[PDB]
Write a protein that binds this ligand. Structure first.
Ligand SMILES: [Mg+2]
Ligand SMILES: [Mg+2]
Lengths: 131, 204, 311, 131, 311
């Protein structure tokens, strides 16, 4: 799907269509759906939001998931994962901006950019594993 | 988890084995920790110590317990050249300090008395090569030497492994007619008079 | 007279305040309008390490040794230093005055701003650069001042040289009188020899004046004790040198071969096992900084430094 | 996090001529209201209120994230994982064959290499991911 | 041994390259992955003075005295230091190695990449911030390296310590032998007295070991010369002090009353008008740092420091 909304109440109107479509993404293949902005990299924006169908979540969270739903929901907190997802993509932009030719064991700007990314992996690894 | 949790349970265990023939005296610390205590107790702090087969220098970090005031150099050897690198990695300053590591016995020149620790090193290379090492150490200017090897008569509860007779014959061949005081003793849990590691305290 | 020979000393101005209280902003106008002034600033030392704020205890400890090394180097040069106080907490604020008071007329300017005009320029600052200071860490600081503000007057405190009065250890004077002398760099000028490879020391040069002290002290009850940090291995090029110059002596003490510890602590160990309780030390003659510091500071003995140490 | 491991990992990141690095992806915000822990609605909405009005919605597939360094010379193509890692432990020809469906979708006129974000199937062959 | 006593010292790393060559960018990755390292950086010192780029010759020499005082403070602390080469030339590159090689194993990394996209990374570093670097100023730098790259090896300079061969001034040995002793802080212990108001020196204390060198020096051919920075006004609290403590002496030399020049130069001037060429000095006994340097360095005499100067 591709959408441009212009105003928040156009969004309101086409939602039920979009909702109905991802509603059918249910076969064994599919973690679920992902939401990206048209432009792949924007300042301060995350690359995407995943939205996993109930059947797949049941796998990450366990067989008691529906029975335990309001619980899990209350426990859910994406504010930290979202920040890392954002910073993580921002590093990648800089890593990509580095010219392939210049990739090498003494490109100490590349080495920095990586060490940065590596550090932010150790951070994003301590978060709720089911995200 | 505690030694007075232990103290309260030890009688119960000992009794259990008494009506199974076995006269067991349990100890709380693991076999290794018993070894470390015996040596440290026996050698004391008054002479500089020589740690042969010092490995990860676990005996080093014990003598440097602030409590003890180790006011000497500390000599160490391992032939294993991975330890080789580790010692040299405390010229990271992390403490030289008084360490002196050597892998070539011709690089040890200290002529004053030392105490000598030979823990569980004589069975991580050959008996011919063990003799060679021990015989060397007994030539050096030492006060006390402690040699430690497992007691094989204990292996029945689970390079080469020596019996108490075998070990005592080894020490005798290495001391020969020199004039030393040689003392044996077990270290660790004592089942029917037999312990899991056996030891000598050779004294000048 | 004395009333009219008076000397003047560099000024140190310490800027006491909460983050946001306009400490920096004052210094910027100060060192541009007043005259002999250099600023020292801790955050900038952080930037050198590519960290933006508060770092590892590692870096942070070292940065201090840098700050103090810098303030003093500047102060010694008869240059005025303006520096931000490290905190407002009385005792670090005292620690500062200890450190620097040998060196300068200290003065203070406090930046006492109300708690919410401190946030209203901390959240107009923290839009500027990357940094941030919450409304927690500001207030441990604002009230912290209001308390230490109350139990200390930010009065000018003129240069204090405190003369640790020279007090020697108490010795049993009935013991025999003796002087103790170093070899390497003191009685023996090693003269291009290897410091550590003393195998050729029988061809060193004689520090003639020190020799004439030992040669004079032995013309009295004084036993002349030589205590060298040279390995005992090299003991025979050594008493070859000594006899060569008729430097007779009662006792030559040397470093255990293969010891290799810092040469102060083996000398101190040497002193206690072999000299203390058995002699009366009038004074000692050594050369090396580390070792003279040992003698003077750890054992409280008279030690006359012969030439420059600092190695 | 041992300095020497990071160092050599990076050294290899440089030798292997890697020029990109995946982000972690956050779930969409929960909607207690809509009784779902990752909400399709609250997620797209988030983008809107942040001034992004043009968005995409793909289907996320059960597979491993890999970056294909699609050299024009298809022999030269290698794979890197969600981390900074050359994917060697696969028969480079079965891999390359599956990769050729793709290869023939491009004009390779003065184009030596396209770096392409992809999912590998099943999650099986590579790592495991959820097992 | 020497083969087998090897000693280890902090490393100092020097970063040689024109601006844009990745000096910082490297250091940023370096101090994060290697282990015992603090970076010292000149530019960051500028910012403390709120200068963006090169400042007054005032600030600039002062900024240096801070930089080396910091690099040394860190090196002394057995901590490794990384610095950008200062001028990137040859001779300042030498000044660096001169200043610092006593303290550390020096080594270098050169960042020698081309002038035309040294401009293409200097003109992308000069718009994040402000700045400008003319492809003139960057051009002074690329070749200045190219000449010094050409006549200087950038491979390691292991810690070189260097002993000054102690060579005394030549004294006409025909003269009578005499020893010279300071008063304030050497033979006469002030014990809270005013340094400048020597009117109560009649109630000073006696530094016994020094007194015992003078009391022994005269029990030999030695004439005892006392040379004080005390104003001559206070001469009878002084030979009251002297008489009180059985300190017999041949010659008391003192500061002209109302002189007030710094006490270095009035002691040196006194030496030439009242002692030099007319006596033979075996050695001198003084205390104050400033003055000892004087005897030792300027007049090249044996001078034994009794306690700590540094005032
Ligand atoms: Mg010396
Ligand atoms: Mg004086």
């Amino acid at each position: 799907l591709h959408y441009q909304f212009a105003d928040r109440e156009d969004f309101e109107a086409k939602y039920p269509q979009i909702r109905a479509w991802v509603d059918q993404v249910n076969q064994s293949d599919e973690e679920g759906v992902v939401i990206k902005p048209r432009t792949a990299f924007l300042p301060g924006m995350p690359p995407a939001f995943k939205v996993r169908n109930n059947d797949y979540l049941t796998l990450v969270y366990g067989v008691d998931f529906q029975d335990r739903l309001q619980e899990q929901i209350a426990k859910r907190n994406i504010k930290g994962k979202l920040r890392c997802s954002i910073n993580d993509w921002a590093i990648n932009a800089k890593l990509l901006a580095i010219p392939y030719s210049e990739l090498g064991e003494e490109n100490y700007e590349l080495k920095n950019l990586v060490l940065d990314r590596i550090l932010g992996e150790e951070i994003e690894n301590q978060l709720d594993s089911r995200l | 988890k505690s030694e007075r949790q232990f103290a309260e349970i030890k009688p119960m265990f000992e009794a259990y084995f008494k009506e199974e023939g076995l006269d067991i005296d349990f100890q709380f610390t693991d076999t290794h920790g018993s070894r470390m205590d015996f040596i440290v107790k026996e050698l004391g702090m008054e002479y500089p110590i020589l740690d042969i087969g010092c490995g990860e220098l676990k005996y080093y970090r014990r003598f440097m317990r602030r409590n003890y005031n180790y006011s000497h150099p500390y000599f160490a050897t391992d032939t294993d050249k991975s330890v080789g690198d580790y010692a040299a990695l405390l010229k990271e300053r992390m403490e030289a300090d008084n360490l002196y590591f050597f892998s070539d016995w011709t690089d040890y020149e200290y002529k004053n008395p030392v105490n000598i620790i030979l823990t569980e090193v004589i069975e991580h290379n050959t008996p011919e090569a063990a003799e060679a090492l021990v015989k060397h150490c007994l030539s050096l200017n030492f006060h006390k030497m402690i040699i430690t090897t497992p007691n094989s008569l204990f292996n029945k509860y689970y390079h080469f492994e020596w019996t108490p007779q075998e070990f005592q014959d080894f020490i005798r061949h290495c001391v020969g007619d020199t004039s030393l005081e040689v003392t044996y003793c077990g270290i660790g849990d004592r089942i029917n008079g037999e312990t899991p590691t056996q030891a000598v305290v050779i004294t000048r | 007279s004395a009333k009219n020979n008076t000397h003047h000393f560099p000024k140190l101005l310490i800027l006491v305040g909460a983050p946001g209280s306009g400490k920096s902003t004052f210094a910027r106008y100060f060192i541009r309008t007043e005259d002999n002034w250099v600023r020292v600033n801790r955050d900038d030392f952080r930037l050198m390490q590519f960290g933006d704020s508060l770092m590892s205890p590692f870096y942070e400890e070292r940065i201090t040794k840098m700050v103090e090394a810098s303030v003093i180097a500047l102060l010694k040069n008869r240059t005025n230093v303006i520096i931000d106080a490290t905190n407002s907490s009385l005792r670090s604020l005292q620690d500062m005055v200890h450190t620097y008071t040998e060196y300068a007329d200290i003065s203070f300017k406090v930046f006492d701003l109300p708690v919410e005009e401190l946030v209203k320029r901390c959240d107009k600052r923290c839009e500027q650069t990357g940094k941030f200071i919450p409304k927690s860490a500001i207030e441990k600081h604002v009230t912290q001042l209001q308390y230490t503000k109350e139990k200390f007057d930010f009065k000018p405190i003129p240069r204090a040289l405190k003369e640790t009065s020279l007090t020697y250890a108490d010795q049993d004077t009935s013991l025999p009188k003796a002087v103790i002398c170093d070899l390497d760099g003191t009685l023996s000028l090693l003269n291009g020899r290897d410091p550590y490879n003393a195998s050729t020391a029988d061809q060193d040069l004689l520090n003639t004046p020190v020799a004439m002290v030992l040669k004079m002290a032995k013309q009295q009850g004084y036993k002349v004790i030589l205590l060298s940090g040279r390995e005992n291995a090299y003991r025979e090029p050594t008493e070859r040198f000594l006899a060569k110059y008729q430097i007779d002596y009662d006792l030559l003490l040397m470093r255990d071969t293969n010891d290799y510890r810092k040469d102060n602590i083996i000398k101190k160990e040497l002193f206690l096992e072999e000299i203390q309780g058995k002699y009366f030390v009038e004074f000692l003659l050594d050369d090396r900084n580390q070792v003279v510091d040992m003698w003077r500071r750890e054992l409280a003995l008279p030690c006359f430094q012969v030439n420059y140490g600092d190695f | 996090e041992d300095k020497t491991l990071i160092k050599k990992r990076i050294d290899w990141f440089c030798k292997n001529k890697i020029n990109a690095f995946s982000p972690t992806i956050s779930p969409a915000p929960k909607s207690v209201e809509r009784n779902e822990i990752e909400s399709l609605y609250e997620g797209i909405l988030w983008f809107v209120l942040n001034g992004v009005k043009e968005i995409v919605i793909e289907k996320k597939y059960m597979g491993s994230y890999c970056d294909i360094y699609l050299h024009r010379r298809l022999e030269d193509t290698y794979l890197v994982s969600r981390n900074g890692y050359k994917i060697n432990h696969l028969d480079q020809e079965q891999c390359l064959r599956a990769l050729q469906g793709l290869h023939d979708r491009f004009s390779w006129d003065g184009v030596e290499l396209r770096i392409i974000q992809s999912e590998l199937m099943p999650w099986s062959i590579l790592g495991k991911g959820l097992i």
